[PDB]
Design a protein around this ligand. Structure first.
Ligand SMILES: NCCNS(=O)(=O)c1ccc(NC(=O)CCCC[C@@H]2SC[C@@H]3NC(=O)N[C@@H]32)cc1
Ligand SMILES: NCCNS(=O)(=O)c1ccc(NC(=O)CCCC[C@@H]2SC[C@@H]3NC(=O)N[C@@H]32)cc1
Ligand SMILES: NCCNS(=O)(=O)c1ccc(NC(=O)CCCC[C@@H]2SC[C@@H]3NC(=O)N[C@@H]32)cc1
Ligand SMILES: NCCNS(=O)(=O)c1ccc(NC(=O)CCCC[C@@H]2SC[C@@H]3NC(=O)N[C@@H]32)cc1
Ligand SMILES: [Ir+4]
Ligand SMILES: [Ir+4]
Ligand SMILES: [Ir+4]
Ligand SMILES: [Ir+4]
Ligand SMILES: [Ir+4]
Ligand SMILES: [Ir+4]
Ligand SMILES: [Ir+4]
Ligand SMILES: [Ir+4]
Ligand SMILES: [Ir+4]
Ligand SMILES: [Ir+4]
Ligand SMILES: [Ir+4]
Ligand SMILES: [Ir+4]
Ligand SMILES: [Ir+4]
Ligand SMILES: [Ir+4]
Ligand SMILES: [Ir+4]
Ligand SMILES: [Ir+4]
Lengths: 123, 123, 123, 123
């Protein structure tokens, strides 16, 4: 799955996820969001299960982007959790949590939840 | 917040999160879970907003653990998303997503959601 | 949106959601899941915003199914939260939480998160 | 658990949840939020597993509030999913999803996730 994962992925919004999978389980790369308070590339880091159960079973993985680079600071961070499924139409199906840096007035409302599907071809 | 974050944290279950915050926004360290299919330490990586809005506002951050080390492979990965709040009782308040590597029979049921609060003193 | 909502909806898994929207904001109906520990129809109840902001804006809503009927007891319950969007291809886009009745050994792992999209035509 | 559930509950924010559990699995009542865009009581409806596995196991349940009453319309709705645990310190431990009625500019950001713990005594 190392070879499967490494590369460029696109989600349903047009965002671009460029990642390298390490042999040890590391994930490193850059993320560019087509939406929100974001411009250009942001660093990402994460992990994956580098010894999946190959018996028709996806590979677990996750990663994080803090939404600060040289251009913008959106005072927020997103984590995606999901699985890589290989094959002719390879996908990474994820859910995500986006937490914003705020005061303790709306701290109850600090996190969005959503989902992203990544494919090797761009919509 | 770099100095604030770096160190050892404990959640309400007794798990131990040892992290170093980089000046650039990197998070690196190890995680030991007191529960689930887990034993000893696991690598973690993540990111944080290294230029918060200091106006009473938390620092956004997240990180990932893939639940494979030399002892066990739980074919899963967890991402935590939340915020660091500094001060006399410093906390990292998070929500988390745990995705399991499974077939496409229960792929609809691939992810748990939960929440963890981390403190500098252990319960 | 009352007229919009009331009716039969289908999700991407083949499940069937039959609902009536009340003028007061009530939602009542039955749910049949194509997957999981489920057979035949289950009662549902929920609510919707019966005075949306009609300025291109979806209508907020949610509902609950407890997964017990005359045939099966799956000791669980699911809530869906999302929005109705009207028009030629009307949709209800939701996220959901499914909580299982368990002991306090895996209570940290009590809830799944997922997402469903409902359409008026069945896949 | 019918007798257990029916009554007045308080969460960690000071909100008040007044509910009646039906013998058939119905939940009906009113919710008053101490926070957000909310004033006075709002109708709620939901369901619970009215034949739990009494072997130390919680009772699954959920419910919905649409945040419109005679005073305010917050164009949103919240669903809570969780479990009732009985005894000397009875609790309802939940996670929740709050979806807002918005356009398809930030539809990716339509839902918050959080968690509430309800007790029979108010903080
Ligand atoms: N009131 C002030 C602003 N309003 S606010 O609500 O407080 C708020 C604050 C910060 C954000 N932060 C971002 O906008 C960064 C990019 C997020 C891209 C997501 S990351 C998940 C999803 N997938 C993707 O490829 N792009 C999207 C979002 C909303
Ligand atoms: N049917 C086979 C097993 N059953 S299964 O359901 O498929 C399943 C599969 C894998 C897992 N994976 C783990 O158990 C690793 C540690 C998780 C620790 C969490 S991580 C969030 C929480 N916080 C913490 O400090 N510890 C806990 C959990 C459940
Ligand atoms: N170890 C014992 C069983 N394993 S367990 O993990 O503890 C567990 C326990 C109970 C359930 N409960 C159901 O299976 C009922 C139907 C759920 C349908 C969902 S509801 C959201 C989604 N949308 C839909 O239309 N169908 C699906 C699921 C998993
Ligand atoms: N930009 C315009 C407003 N900003 S917005 O972000 O779009 C937005 C829109 C609507 C809401 N809707 C409410 O505020 C109603 C009460 C929610 C109470 C929760 S319900 C879960 C939690 N538990 C509880 O007892 N009270 C709290 C929240 C945020
Ligand atoms: Ir395996
Ligand atoms: Ir918070
Ligand atoms: Ir919280
Ligand atoms: Ir979707
Ligand atoms: Ir700032
Ligand atoms: Ir899946
Ligand atoms: Ir999905
Ligand atoms: Ir809690
Ligand atoms: Ir309006
Ligand atoms: Ir629990
Ligand atoms: Ir909890
Ligand atoms: Ir999807
Ligand atoms: Ir039982
Ligand atoms: Ir949406
Ligand atoms: Ir969506
Ligand atoms: Ir909490």
């Amino acid at each position: 799955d190392e070879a499967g994962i490494t590369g460029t992925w696109y989600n349903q919004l047009g965002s671009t996820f460029i990642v390298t999978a390490g042999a040890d389980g590391a994930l490193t790369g850059t993320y560019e969001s087509a939406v929100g308070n974001a411009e250009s590339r942001y660093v990402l880091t994460g992990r994956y299960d580098s010894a999946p159960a190959t018996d028709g079973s996806g590979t677990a993985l996750g990663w994080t982007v803090a939404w600060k680079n040289n251009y913008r600071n959106a005072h927020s961070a997103t984590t995606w959790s999901g699985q890589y499924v290989g094959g002719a139409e390879a996908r990474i199906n994820t859910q995500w949590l986006l937490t914003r840096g705020t005061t303790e007035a709306p701290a109850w409302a600090m996190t969005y939840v959503g989902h992203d599907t990544f494919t090797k071809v761009k919509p």
